[PDB]
């Protein structure tokens, strides 16, 4: 319904700049839109390693 199934695949592309440090991150995931559950693996493709905690980005994907 509305293009969604019970299991679905996800894709993330973040362009950012924190405290002047420019970075890029991509990730893939699996999630159950009706169980309100999702699990994503992220990998920094530019600006690795990050000069800040990974936590501030979590709600960003």
């Amino acid at each position: 319904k509305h293009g969604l199934k019970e299991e679905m695949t996800m894709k993330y592309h973040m362009e950012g700049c924190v405290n002047g440090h420019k970075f890029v991150i991509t990730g893939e995931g699996i999630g159950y839109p009706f169980k309100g559950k999702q699990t994503i693996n992220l990998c920094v493709i530019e600006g690795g390693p990050l000069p800040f905690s990974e936590d501030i980005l979590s709600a960003g994907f």
Binding site: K1, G3, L4, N19, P33, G36, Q38, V44, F52
Partner: protein, 162 residues
């Protein structure tokens, strides 16, 4: 992505309803020590692939050099309760949640999220204000070559309990 939220039948699911065309949101982050982040996201459903695309811009400034963020003193976001209110004439939603980042010392670090959820389609049904409860965990899986980590979420929409 507020599509990964279990909605009960009696609360209108704005996010799942917006699909597959999807929706956009902007969020301000205000940290207790004066840092400010903004995030913009574009979520679209390719039904061909059975896949959800996220395109995010993320900017932040004035994190103190010896703060817990720059020094990486944070373990996880504490479990939260977000307030989703409708905006009657504009056909959009507004997130308001107070968030706590647990410091490895056993303390807290506060951030105010103010989100505007705005569907690409003009929506038929608008929800009444309700709550969403989130639990978001992180595990770093960094190797010699790349920096990587896993996230897991669980979100459930609720009305007032009273």
């Amino acid at each position: 992505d507020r599509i990964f939220t279990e909605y009960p039948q009696d609360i209108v699911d704005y996010f799942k309803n917006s699909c597959p065309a999807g929706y956009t949101w902007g969020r301000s982050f205000l940290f207790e020590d004066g840092a400010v982040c903004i995030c913009n996201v574009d979520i679209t459903v390719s039904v061909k692939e059975n896949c959800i695309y996220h395109k995010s811009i993320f900017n932040g400034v004035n994190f103190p050099a010896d703060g817990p963020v720059m020094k990486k003193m944070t373990t996880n976001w504490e479990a939260s309760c977000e307030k989703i209110m409708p905006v009657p004439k504009q056909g959009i939603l507004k997130g308001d949640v107070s968030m706590y980042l647990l410091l490895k010392d056993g303390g807290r670090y506060r951030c105010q999220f103010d989100t505007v959820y705005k569907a690409k389609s003009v929506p038929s049904k608008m929800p009444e204000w309700h709550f969403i409860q989130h639990k978001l965990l992180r595990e770093d899986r960094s190797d010699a070559k790349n920096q990587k980590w896993q996230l897991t979420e669980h979100a459930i929409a609720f009305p007032s309990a009273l």
